[PDB]
Each structure stands twice: as C-alpha cells, then as structure tokens.
Structure 1
Amino acid sequence: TDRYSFSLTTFSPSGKLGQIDYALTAVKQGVTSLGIKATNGVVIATEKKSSSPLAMSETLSKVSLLTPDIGAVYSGMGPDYRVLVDKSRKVAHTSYKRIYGEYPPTKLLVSEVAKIMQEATQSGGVRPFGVSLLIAGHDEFNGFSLYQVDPSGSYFPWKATAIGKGSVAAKTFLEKRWNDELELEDAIHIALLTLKESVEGEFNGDTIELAIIGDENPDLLGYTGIPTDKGPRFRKLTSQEINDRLEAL
C-alpha cells in the first residue's frame, strides 16, 4: 500500500518549493518549443530531436491534438508530457463534453491541466511534473489563444513565447518580430526563423514538428451532411508543407 501519504514538495526556510524549482530546471534543459499567436490563427512548434537515427521519430509526437480546436507542445520530460496529454484529452470529455455537449474553451482545458499539475505539487507521495506546456486553441467566444503551463500549475496567456533550452534568446527574437497584425503565414514564418536559432543539426520537415490552430478543415471531418459541423481547427503540418516554407525563408 502506498504509505507515502505526506507531501514530497514542501516550503524551505527561504519560502522556496524546492521540487518545483527543480522541475523547472528539468524544463530548462529540455528542447526548445514555442508558440505564436496571429490574428487568424496560432502556431506551435518544436524540434524533433531524434534519440538515434534508427528511431522512427514520426512515431514520437511532441505536438498533440487535445480537442479538435486545441493542441499542445512541451519542453522537459517527454514521458510526463505523454501522460498529461492522455489525462487532458480525457478531462476535456469527463468534466466538460459529457456535461455541455461541446468541447471546452481553451482557457478552461488549460485550467484543468493546470489543476492536475498543481496537485502533483501538494498531494501525498508524488513529485511535480517535469514539463512546461504551451497550449494553443480556438473557441467561439474567446477566439484564438495561447497559454503556458508550468510545473507549479501556474498558467499565463501569451501573444508569443518560448520555453526550454533557448527560450531567453527566442523570446527576445519574438519581441522584435511580433505585432497585432500578423496573419497565420507570417507567424509560421517567424516560428521557423526563431526555431532555426536553437537548432544545431539538420533543419527540415523531418526534424521540425509544427502545428497550427486556424480555419476549420471540413476535409478532415470524416463525414458530410451536418451544416454546423465544419471540421477541426487543429492541423499538424506535413514534412513537405514545412519544407515548402523553408525555401521562402
């Protein structure tokens, strides 16, 4: 029986929560990921840093669909991210869709993920999650949005941001280039430029993972005949689609 019913994260004399600080350090080591909000979309992007070349890195998905209009990326511990994605997909249903018959708005799904992360910071016998998330989404009444969630459970909305390794440089790069009139293609172009700085090796469609929240894709719905159902706004760009935009770089 789990006999660790006491907190493993506690306050030190200086007021610090050590385990949260250390989770944040694990995030700091993580591969860079970023997101940029345009007027008509959001882009999230990261590097697919393949662990061996015998690994098939398209089978490792760092950018994840949470709902048809919400996607997530991370920096830090991959396995922690994968389980959070499973829980986030589920909670979108159990605490929202099965009640209201519609997917949650971005900010409330973020809220639910954040709560899960907060509880790993206070509940008995567990450590905090060693990841920061960037969550991009659209919903009818709030439009496009982009949030960061940290190991403490704190979340903040951004116009554009970066997390992980090269984030201090990437954020300065983004402050120069961001304005409130970017069109989604502009934000994609800026994302690719920003991401090049933190990437050492190969830089192409097979080593970059990029997704957008944009227009509804009726072609990805899987059925026709219900006028109000127009398709998911989340879309992962292909290897080829990324490379096309890398000549325009």
Structure 2
Amino acid sequence: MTDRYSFSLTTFSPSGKLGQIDYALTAVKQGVTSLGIKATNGVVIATEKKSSSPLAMSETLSKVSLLTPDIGAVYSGMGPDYRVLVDKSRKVAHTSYKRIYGEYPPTKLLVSEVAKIMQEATQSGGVRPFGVSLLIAGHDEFNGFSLYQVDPSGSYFPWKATAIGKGSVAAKTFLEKRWNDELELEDAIHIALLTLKESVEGEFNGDTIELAIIGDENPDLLGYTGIPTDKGPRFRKLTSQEINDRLEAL
C-alpha cells in the first residue's frame, strides 16, 4: 500500500525533450481557445463555454475564476486540472502572503506561486504534469495591470495580449494586427470578442462566451461601507446580458 512511486515520471529523453511536458502541451493544444488582452486601464480575459449537452447548465461551470479580488484566471486544456489549481492558487495567496503581510499578493508573485506548483508536478515522485496553460490577469498598486501565461512546465511570461489552445496561432496573428499601447478597456473587450468569433464554430452569444475584466474598483461589489481605503474588487465577470449588448455593436 501507499505511494511506492517516489521516483519521477517525467524524465529527459536522449534528445533532451521532457516527454510528459511536451504531451501536456499537446493536451493544451486540443483545449478550447482562450485569450487575454491588456488595455491601458484594464485587462480582459475571455473563452468559449462549449457545452457537454444542452441539458447541462453551463453557468454552473465557471472557466473564468476569481483568485483574489484583483486577479482572475482562465485556461485551455483539462478542466479538472484547472479546477484544483484554482483551489490551490486561492489558498496559497492566503497562506504564503495575506496571512503574512495583511494584503493580497501582486499578480507576478501569485503567478510565480502557481508556476511553482506546476513545476513540482514536473519533477516530484509519482505524478504527471498538469495538462493546462493558464492566463492570469490582475492589478496591484505598484505594478499596475498585467497579464501572464503559465505553461505545464511551470514557465510563465508576461504578455500585452495572447491566446492559447485550439485556434491560438490564428488568434495571436489577429491580436498582433489590432493591438497597440493606447487601447482603452472597452476597445480591448471589443477586440477580444472579435478574435473569439474566429475560433467559435457554433452559437456566439452571452451564454456561450465567458468573459471577465480586471479594471476599476467596484464599491457596489464590496458588501459593506465605511472604510474609505477599501474600494472593492477590480475583478468583474461580465453578465450574459452585458456581453450581448456589445455583440449588437460588433
């Protein structure tokens, strides 16, 4: 009984590739497209909510997740791997940061922490790598708005804009054409919706698209009043209704 697999399941092949990381990336390749774009006063992350059946309620399946009040995540690859990573990412933001400094981690550091968890699954005994790539968008007082990509290897890179999964190659080309360093948040949302329509085959509407922003503080979403310095979460999930509003003016 117990884990007698104390040895690595990811190892260097003679050519120097790490097979299981490569294959995990291949699983990310098959995953449904998701993307992120960084505006001057915000970040937008978006993805398709491709359903398992029309009997399934796809509202109950959240592909875009709040990690901290100013950080959100989206992914491409294996959903259940993503789900446990979000759980761990939320906890680690508390255990190794908030419980120490009394404030939430800045984007780059929480990303660093997630990357560490993913790296360890690439070397520790008796596990496979995580089969996802994450896009993490956030804001913090001293670094402003940022957007990171985290891969199965544990590598992460900051992006102005990018996509991952199925139709990433086309989407990245599309984003290069439309991105500039003067985009206002609403412009980026509109570019995101345009990019995503290329990769979406079937229905394209507020119920088939999941989309969130890191933007202004939302005092209406705080839950209480009377502490001036607490102004509310910068993360906001756009409603099914809010997405459709922007689809008429597409």
TM-score (norm 1): 1.00
**Does the residue aligned with 2:232 lie in a helix, a strand or coil?**
coil
Structure 1 counterpart of 2:177: 176
Give me the whole-angstrom Cα distance separating, in 1, the residues matched to 2:239 and 2:204.
14
What is the count of residue pairs matched by the alignment? 249
How far does residue 23 in structure 1 lie from its aligned partner after superposition? Answer: 0.0
How far does residue 106 in structure 1 lie from its aligned partner after superposition? Answer: 0.1
How far does residue 69 in structure 1 lie from its aligned partner after superposition? Answer: 0.1
Give me the whole-angstrom Cα distance separating, in 1, the residues matched to 2:235 and 2:11.
39
Give me the whole-angstrom Cα distance separating, in 1, the residues matched to 2:130 and 2:52.
22
How far does residue 171 in structure 1 lie from its aligned partner after superposition? Answer: 0.1
How far does residue 218 in structure 1 lie from its aligned partner after superposition? Answer: 0.2
Deviations 1:26-74, CA, capped at 9 Å, x for gaps: 0000000000000000000000000100000000000000000000000
Percent sequence identity over matched residues? 100
**Does the residue aligned with 1:176 lie in a helix, a strand or coil?**
helix
**Does the residue aligned with 2:186 lie in a helix, a strand or coil?**
helix
Give me the whole-angstrom Cα distance separating, in 2, the residues matched to 1:52 and 1:78.
16
How far does residue 168 in structure 1 lie from its aligned partner after superposition? Answer: 0.2
**Does the residue aligned with 2:194 lie in a helix, a strand or coil?**
helix
Give me the whole-angstrom Cα distance separating, in 2, the residues matched to 1:134 and 1:193.
18
How far does residue 81 in structure 1 lie from its aligned partner after superposition? Answer: 0.1
Q: Any unmatched runs of 5+ in structure 1?
A: none
**Does the residue aligned with 1:132 lie in a helix, a strand or coil?**
strand
Q: Any unmatched runs of 5+ in structure 2?
A: none
Deviations 1:131-156, CA, capped at 9 Å, x for gaps: 00000000000000000000000000
**Does the residue aligned with 1:58 lie in a helix, a strand or coil?**
coil
How far does residue 174 in structure 1 lie from its aligned partner after superposition? Answer: 0.1
Give me the whole-angstrom Cα distance separating, in 1, the residues matched to 2:121 and 2:248.
44
How far does residue 192 in structure 1 lie from its aligned partner after superposition? Answer: 0.0
TM superposition outliers: structure 1 runs of 4+ over 6 Å: none
How far does residue 164 in structure 1 lie from its aligned partner after superposition? Answer: 0.1
Deviations 1:165-216, CA, capped at 9 Å, x for gaps: 0000000000000000000000000000000000000000000000000000
Give me the whole-angstrom Cα distance separating, in 2, the residues matched to 1:16 and 1:172.
27
Give me the whole-angstrom Cα distance separating, in 2, the residues matched to 1:219 and 1:69.
15
How far does residue 230 in structure 1 lie from its aligned partner after superposition? Answer: 0.1
How far does residue 84 in structure 1 lie from its aligned partner after superposition? Answer: 0.1
Give me the whole-angstrom Cα distance separating, in 1, the residues matched to 2:190 and 2:120.
38
Give me the whole-angstrom Cα distance separating, in 2, the residues matched to 1:9 and 1:121.
6
Deviations 1:82-108, CA, capped at 9 Å, x for gaps: 000000000000000000000000000
Give me the whole-angstrom Cα distance separating, in 1, the residues matched to 2:61 and 2:77.
15
**1:2 lines up with 2:17 in the alignment:** no
**Does the residue aligned with 2:56 lie in a helix, a strand or coil?**
coil
Structure 1 counterpart of 2:101: 100
**Does the residue aligned with 1:212 lie in a helix, a strand or coil?**
strand
**Does the residue aligned with 1:227 lie in a helix, a strand or coil?**
coil
**Does the residue aligned with 2:59 lie in a helix, a strand or coil?**
helix
**Does the residue aligned with 1:94 lie in a helix, a strand or coil?**
helix
Give me the whole-angstrom Cα distance separating, in 1, the residues matched to 2:182 and 2:52.
38
How far does residue 112 in structure 1 lie from its aligned partner after superposition? Answer: 0.1
TM-score (norm 2): 1.00
